[PDB]
Design a binder for this molecule. Structure first.
Ligand SMILES: CC(=O)N[C@H]1[C@@H](OP(=O)(O)OP(=O)(O)OC[C@H]2O[C@@H](n3ccc(=O)[nH]c3=O)[C@H](O)[C@@H]2O)O[C@H](CO)[C@@H](O)[C@@H]1O[C@H](C)C(=O)O
Length: 417
């Protein structure tokens, strides 16, 4: 659909906002249900497009389920092992169905992702892991055909840190009744949340450094789980408070999943005060330039990069923002330039020369998480900012415009087919 936002800038964000459950924790945890025949219940699941597409895939695979009040109730009566190309094109993370399907049936046919606007994003590490696990892997008709003659222990080291690669491996190993080892894994909070679910199902998982020791099972149980809060949504509103010189109180977020973000926010001039579990955020000092490099968790998230770039576009001084994760992820830099920013891009590094003010205009969303930076800039740009193709934002945030409106943003959504 062609829905868009109209943001009339000039209001400080003030008040409370409740942070939703983590989209990227809910996805792998939903795919984990494929590993059991028993009913599972998942709560604090956000109602956003990626979740809806994952539920559609599970239904296509044979599951019976309901999604009500941010809760997924599922009977994993999986009777197929084909994840079609259409679903993969809609959400490449559907590749997470591979590990579970293989663990359940010993075979799987999953569409191979195409390129993405964020980058080529190949899955060589996922395929390399399954080959090392002893599976026969072949690409034909644009699908990855995987066949496993027998489950055996695996000892695999990732060549690079990959979030879903780690998850896909854990999902499969949880079904193998032997002691396996993964090295150089991702430590993201969402990966840790998936791990608790796999343990609830009956697998044993020990994390030490970036190594994971797994002991799986062929009789995994059903589970009940409440997913962790979404730290990217939390960081986004924090940035919004500081950028608009407002004062907000985030409810249901976790300070322990935000260290690198809070650190950078304070260096720029913001302040974050914990009140019980709530986080009060406001601007303490005038905005100033800061250098930022994205890194795997616990470092600064690539999913927060664009948002900080918008904040820094109006800070005093020149900021250097380097991507070590998705080096190509800078489409938003030029959209911000359309608002009067002065951002340059050279290879994997962007330089932001802060300007006194931004000027509202039409910009296009293209990244389910990074495009939140455009909405943020629209909050302070002079006049009116029109954010096109919010379908992307609908994939990545739950009720974004409603939450901003509740905080005082003069924002509205125009529904357009
Ligand atoms: C569903 C989900 O959790 N998706 C998230 C996860 O994608 P993922 O794909 O697993 O991230 P990677 O594998 O850690 O990618 C990190 C780098 O590693 C390269 N690489 C990855 C795997 C591989 O086999 N080969 C390989 O080369 C790759 O190209 C990238 O440059 O991690 C990213 C980084 O934190 C997030 O931005 C992304 O959110 C997104 C936006 C969203 O919400 O939709």
């Amino acid at each position: 659909y062609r829905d868009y936002f109209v943001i009339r800038g000039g209001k400080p964000l003030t008040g409370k906002v409740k942070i939703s459950g983590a989209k990227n924790a809910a996805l792998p945890i939903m795919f984990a249900t494929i590993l059991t025949e028993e009913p599972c219940t998942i709560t604090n699941v956000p109602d956003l497009l990626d979740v809806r597409n994952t539920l559609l895939l599970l239904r296509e695979l044979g599951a019976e389920l309901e999604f009500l009040n941010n809760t997924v109730f599922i009977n994993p009566s999986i009777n197929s092992f084909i994840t079609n190309q259409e679903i993969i094109r809609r959400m490449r993370a559907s590749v997470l169905s591979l590990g579970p399907l293989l663990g359940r049936f010993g075979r799987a046919v999953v569409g191979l992702p195409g390129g993405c606007s964020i980058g080529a994003r190949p899955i060589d590490q996922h395929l390399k892991f399954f080959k090392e696990a002893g599976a026969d892997v072949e690409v034909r008709e644009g699908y990855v055909y995987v066949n496993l003659k027998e489950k055996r222990r695996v000892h695999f080291k990732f060549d690079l840190v990959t979030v879903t690669g780690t998850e896909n491996a854990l999902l499969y190993l949880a079904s193998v009744p032997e002691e396996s080892i993964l090295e150089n894994i991702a430590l993201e909070p969402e990966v840790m949340d998936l791990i608790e679910v796999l343990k609830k199902m009956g697998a044993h998982v020990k994390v030490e450094g970036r190594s994971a020791y797994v002991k799986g099972s062929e009789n995994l149980k059903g589970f009940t789980h409440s997913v962790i809060p979404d730290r990217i949504e939390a960081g986004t509103f924090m940035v919004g408070a500081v950028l608009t010189d407002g004062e907000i109180l985030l409810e249901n977020a976790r300070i322990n999943h935000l260290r690198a973000v809070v650190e950078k926010l304070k260096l720029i001039g913001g302040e974050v005060v914990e009140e019980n579990g709530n986080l009060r955020v406001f601007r303490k000092e005038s905005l100033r330039a800061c250098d930022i490099e994205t890194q795997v968790y616990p470092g600064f998230p690539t999913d927060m990069q664009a948002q900080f770039m918008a904040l820094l576009s109006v800070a005093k001084g020149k900021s250097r923002i380097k991507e070590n994760i998705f080096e190509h992820r800078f489409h938003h830099a030029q959209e911000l330039n359309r608002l009067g920013a002065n951002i340059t891009v050279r290879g994997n590094t962007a330089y932001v020369e802060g300007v006194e003010r931004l000027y509202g205009s039409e910009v296009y969303s293209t990244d389910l998480r990074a495009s939140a930076s455009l909405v943020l800039a629209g909050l302070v740009a002079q006049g009116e900012t029109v954010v096109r193709d919010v379908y992307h934002l609908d994939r990545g945030y739950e009720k974004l415009e409603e939450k901003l409106k509740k905080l005082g943003a003069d924002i509205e959504r125009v529904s357009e087919l």
